[PDB]
């Protein structure tokens, strides 16, 4: 159910906690939300993902898009870029 | 004018002269 497949077993009693209450979960899951964003087709071997917004984003990092097969993915945003 | 193997082949020719190995 949750982001990590956290689902109390059919016999676990913490399910009593959810009795007469809502088990809080978020419909918007990141694993999926990042996928939607398309691969950025940059034209330089190495590009940088400042995180969007500079100081309001994530530490700046340079990605090597040299591997033709795969696409570079910022360890921070998850945004992907291909040459 | 010299061929691509000039250096190597010339050397081989010199092998006979080349003093014994260590």
């Amino acid at each position: 159910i949750t982001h990590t497949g956290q689902v109390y077993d059919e016999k676990d009693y913490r399910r009593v906690r959810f009795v007469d209450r809502q088990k809080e979960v978020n419909e918007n899951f990141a694993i999926d939300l990042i996928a939607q964003q398309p691969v950025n087709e940059v034209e330089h071997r190495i590009i940088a993902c400042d995180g969007g917004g500079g100081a309001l984003g994530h530490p700046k990092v340079y990605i090597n898009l040299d591997k033709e097969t795969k696409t570079g993915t910022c360890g921070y945003c998850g945004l992907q870029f291909k040459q | 004018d010299y061929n691509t193997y000039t250096f190597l082949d010339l050397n081989l020719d010199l092998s006979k002269f080349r003093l014994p190995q260590p």
Binding site: - | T6, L10, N11, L14, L19
Partner: protein, 426 residues
């Protein structure tokens, strides 16, 4: 002073004009006293070198005699060796390309004359692979010599047995370095070693070894023939003998001519070679020893004798004595910038200070040519420059820092204006 006589010059075959082959060499009488000299013994030969006062002749001008002497210590059961670097990579150096191509023999007897001085079992000549044709010339010459019996067992009538080999370089400036020539000879990657295990002590293949600029090996037979005194007389004090001078760039007749070392610079371009293109007034700067040495502007170019002592007083190095001249028609900021590009495309990357430092100066230098960088950045490069100068495993990092230091030292106002020019147009 200067004005060496052609008669007292060493490579008469310079500029060709005489068969680089043996015959022409016999008329030159290059192989005249070779048997006798070797018969004299290792010590006597090395002694003549000391008397000569001959310095390096290659990159750093270490006293040749003392250096070679370091392997005149008794053999410890490992064959001693001779390595004659002919990489000739320092930008501006065609100095060596001559002896190798024009007068291969002089170097062949230089090798055996030098060999008995160090008691080397054999000599390997690392001519840069770029010069394939050059190689063709020397082993033809080496082949002639053995056919004659001048080299090999029974070398020139001497019980001494010396074998000379030629090794292919593969387009690396660093291969030139003394510890790195060895590793290329050893077959590993061309990465210099640290000096604590000195080259004589740990040799190639762990056998004592010594490395000489081809010019240094070539003059040793003629210096023994002419005697140290004749040679030592030509130079100024410590700086001695006559060193070939290659003048390239912004000069009317660029050429390599050998002249009395300690020859005034304003004169070198004036008497041999040719006048500074556009008049001596059109001299922005000159780099006396090649790319590694700092360029000197026209303040000293007027009166600077080109001897290593005089240059070190001037803060520049005689080096390979390659004179590169820059008229007032050149963007020095870009001239030196390509030399830093020359060093980023070439340093081995073994040591942290050169690897990142040379790349760091390249990035800053490219911005400096554009003028994008602010004025405060200029003194930073200075600080980046000396971090690289004293911390590097080899001298190339030493060499990369000096041109940067020269540009800031004498042309700081021009770089500031390029700084200013870009800021104004926004």
């Amino acid at each position: 002073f200067g004005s060496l006589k052609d008669e007292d010059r060493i490579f008469t075959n310079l500029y060709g004009r005489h068969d680089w082959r043996l015959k022409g060499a016999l008329r030159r009488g290059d192989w005249y006293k070779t048997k006798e000299i070797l018969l004299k013994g290792p010590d006597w030969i090395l002694g003549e070198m000391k008397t000569s006062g001959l310095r390096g002749r290659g990159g750093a001008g270490f006293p040749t005699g003392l250096k070679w002497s370091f392997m005149n210590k008794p053999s410890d059961g490992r064959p001693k060796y001779l390595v004659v670097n002919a990489d000739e990579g320092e930008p501006g150096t065609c100095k060596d390309r001559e002896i190798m191509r024009h007068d291969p023999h002089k170097l062949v007897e230089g090798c055996l004359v030098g060999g008995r001085a160090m008691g080397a079992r054999a000599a390997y000549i690392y001519i840069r692979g770029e010069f394939y044709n050059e190689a063709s010339n020397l082993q033809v010459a080496i082949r002639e010599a053995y056919e004659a019996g001048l080299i090999g067992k029974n070398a020139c009538g001497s019980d001494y047995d010396f074998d000379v080999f030629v090794v292919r370089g593969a387009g690396a400036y660093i291969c030139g370095e003394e510890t790195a020539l060895i590793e290329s000879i050893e077959g590993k990657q061309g990465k210099p070693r640290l000096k604590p295990p000195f080259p004589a002590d740990v040799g190639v293949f762990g056998c004592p070894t010594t490395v000489a600029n081809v010019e240094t090996v070539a003059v040793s037979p003629t210096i023994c023939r002419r005697g140290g005194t004749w040679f030592a007389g030509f130079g100024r004090e410590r700086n001695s003998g006559t060193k070939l001078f290659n003048i390239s760039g912004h000069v009317n007749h660029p050429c390599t001519v050998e002249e009395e070392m300690s020859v005034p610079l304003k004169e070198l371009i004036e008497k041999h070679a040719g006048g500074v293109t556009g008049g001596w007034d059109n001299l922005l700067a000159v780099i006396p020893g090649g790319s590694s040495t700092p360029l000197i502007p026209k303040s000293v170019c007027e009166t600077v004798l080109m001897d290593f002592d005089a240059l070190v007083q001037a803060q520049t190095g005689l080096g390979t004595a390659a004179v590169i001249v820059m008229d007032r028609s050149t963007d020095i900021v870009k001239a030196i910038a390509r030399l830093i590009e020359f060093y980023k495309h070439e340093s081995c990357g073994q040591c942290t200070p050169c690897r990142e430092g040379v790349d760091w100066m390249n990035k800053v230098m490219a911005r400096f040519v554009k003028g994008d960088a602010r004025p405060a950045e200029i003194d930073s490069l200075w600080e980046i420059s000396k971090q690289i100068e004293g911390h590097t495993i080899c001298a190339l990092g030493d060499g990369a820092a000096w041109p940067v230091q020269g540009l800031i030292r004498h042309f700081r106002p021009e770089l500031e204006d390029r700084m200013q020019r870009f800021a104004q147009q926004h």
